[PDB]
Amino acid sequence: ALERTLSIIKPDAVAKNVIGQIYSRFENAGLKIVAARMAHLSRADAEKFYAVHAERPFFKDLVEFMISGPVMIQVLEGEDAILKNRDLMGATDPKKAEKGTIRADFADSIDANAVHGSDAPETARVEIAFFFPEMNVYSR
Amino acid sequence: SMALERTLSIIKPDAVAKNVIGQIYSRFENAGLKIVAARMAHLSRADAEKFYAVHAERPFFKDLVEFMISGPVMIQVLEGEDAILKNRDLMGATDPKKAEKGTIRADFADSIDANAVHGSDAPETARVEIAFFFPEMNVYSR
Ligand SMILES: Nc1ncnc2c1ncn2[C@H]1C[C@H](O)[C@@H](COP(=O)(O)O)O1
Ligand SMILES: [Cl-]
Ligand SMILES: [Cl-]
């Protein structure tokens, strides 16, 4: 159960003051919050984070929405963490997300879709390393 | 209407281990307080000692320090109307035995040593405790 994934509670969900409810989704599902911080990303950092989408027409929108306000960033650890977090988040478009997922419950739109989660083992590694030094990640 | 205040909150290692960070956060957020800074940390002995200096000559001091450093904690700044007192009412009495039902300490604390949470007790300690753990550039009022 040492797999880790990178989660972000996006500015829309922070602004709703539902950080705790989203955290409980993780915790109740058996994931442990092993690193965490509130931050306000710069444009340059949002651009780096979303680099893989630099050529897509929704790039500017991913970026603008991620820097519109503070975010809560955390590392989630546990068995099958990457896929479990994805299951908890639900579909990218909240209109398509299953009932009781984070996006179905807290997302207003595909832009304001509440949360990010790493999509694969290598993106989890890169994203965790982007936001946290290992000395500030506390496995337990 | 009262003064918008910031206070310093810590979810102690007992409650982090319980995986009830979310539940405690929702206590704050449902009471109309906003999380305006946060980070997970593992305090050093020295940092815990500094933080608890007001209790340095007391006999529970060593225990306060060893318990604060026994595992990672979740630290946050809470902002809202009357935040200092509000947080304290939500936490409940220092001794979970004495804490009203529905408080954080009643629901998540196992004892006076393992008592789940800290909150600043006054405006001046709030100021000092926030500055101890966060630079202002990482506190984001909204
Ligand atoms: N208009 C208004 N609304 C809400 N909160 C306010 C206002 N003016 C100051 N403050 C804040 C600043 C302090 O935390 C507290 C008392 O002000 P202090 O001067 O520090 O004793 O209230
Ligand atoms: Cl995303
Ligand atoms: Cl304390």
From Swiss-Prot, chain A:
Location (main, coarse): cytoplasm
SMART domains reported for this sequence: NDK
A cellular component term, taken from the record's GO annotations: cytoplasm
EC number of this enzyme: 2.7.4.6
GO terms under biological process: CTP biosynthetic process; GTP biosynthetic process; UTP biosynthetic process
Protein species of origin: Burkholderia thailandensis (strain ATCC 700388 / DSM 13276 / CCUG 48851 / CIP 106301 / E264)
InterPro entries: NDK-like_dom, NDK-like_dom_sf, Nucleoside_diP_kinase, Nucleoside_diP_kinase_AS
Annotated family: Belongs to the NDK family.
Reaction catalysed by this enzyme: a 2'-deoxyribonucleoside 5'-diphosphate + ATP = a 2'-deoxyribonucleoside 5'-triphosphate + ADP; a ribonucleoside 5'-diphosphate + ATP = a ribonucleoside 5'-triphosphate + ADP
Keyword tags: ATP-binding, Cytoplasm, Kinase, Magnesium, Metal-binding, Nucleotide metabolism, Nucleotide-binding, Phosphoprotein, Transferase
Protein name: Nucleoside diphosphate kinase
